[PDB]
């Protein structure tokens, strides 16, 4: 596509407007249309794509958890049917994002900053599928994408915010999805410690970006230990 007749620059401009208006479904559709133009995305454009779909799937995850909790308590067909409706819509959003990464964002991403960003996303959207799955193959798909993205360790410094956000999300995968709380804690601790030892190399602006994600690693470790 419905965005096939709109200029790429117009879709990006409208994604930024939709973000200002908190219209995240519109923002996601504008960024899908921008991706389908077939050109690689800039750093800013990758971030618009991620923020749009994170917000959309975030609403669906929050709704699914409410309906799942009611359904569990209730144990008529209505609660199950409506939880299934929301689950199917969530799966469709995850499949759309995985479709964009596979056709053809990942294969055309050669720089570490782009390839790690897209592989982290692929891990995240398999993780969201795993949260509602009843499932082993989905978990291994998440793991595989996260692992390729981590193997960041070769190309990025330990304070790189993309590398930090990847390790954050991979640690939560381990804790919540893979039932590996010790792996989760080890990854979060090592990631935090290696970042802390590299902070001395950063400007005031990079330091702010790195320490914000380090605080998320610390918040998890506080809950986990």
């Amino acid at each position: 596509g419905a965005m096939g007749s709109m200029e790429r620059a117009s879709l990006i401009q409208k994604a930024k407007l939709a973000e200002q208006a908190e219209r995240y479904e519109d923002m996601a559709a504008f960024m899908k249309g921008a991706v389908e133009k077939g050109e690689e995305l800039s750093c800013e454009e990758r971030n618009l794509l991620s923020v749009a779909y994170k917000n959309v799937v975030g609403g669906q995850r929050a709704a699914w958890r409410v309906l799942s909790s009611i359904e569990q308590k209730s144990n008529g067909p209505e609660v199950r049917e409506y939880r299934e409706k929301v689950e199917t819509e969530l799966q469709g959003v995850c499949d759309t994002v995985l479709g964009l990464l596979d056709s053809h964002l990942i294969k055309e991403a050669g720089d570490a900053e782009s390839r790690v960003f897209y592989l982290k996303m692929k891990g995240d959207y398999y993780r969201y599928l795993a949260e509602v799955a009843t499932k082993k193959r989905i978990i291994d798909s998440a793991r595989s994408a996260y692992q390729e993205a981590m193997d960041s360790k070769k190309e990025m410094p330990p304070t790189n915010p993309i590398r930090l956000g990847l390790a954050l999300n991979f640690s939560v995968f381990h804790y919540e999805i893979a039932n590996s709380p010790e792996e989760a804690i080890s990854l979060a601790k090592t990631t935090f410690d290696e970042a802390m030892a590299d902070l001395h190399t950063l400007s005031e602006d990079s330091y702010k970006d790195s320490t914000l994600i380090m605080q998320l690693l610390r918040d998890n470790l506080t809950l986990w230990t």
Binding site: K54, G58, Y175, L216, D219
Partner: peptide, 7 residues
């Protein structure tokens, strides 16, 4: 738990 980016 905390994951990267918005809610």
């Amino acid at each position: 738990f905390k994951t990267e980016g918005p809610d």
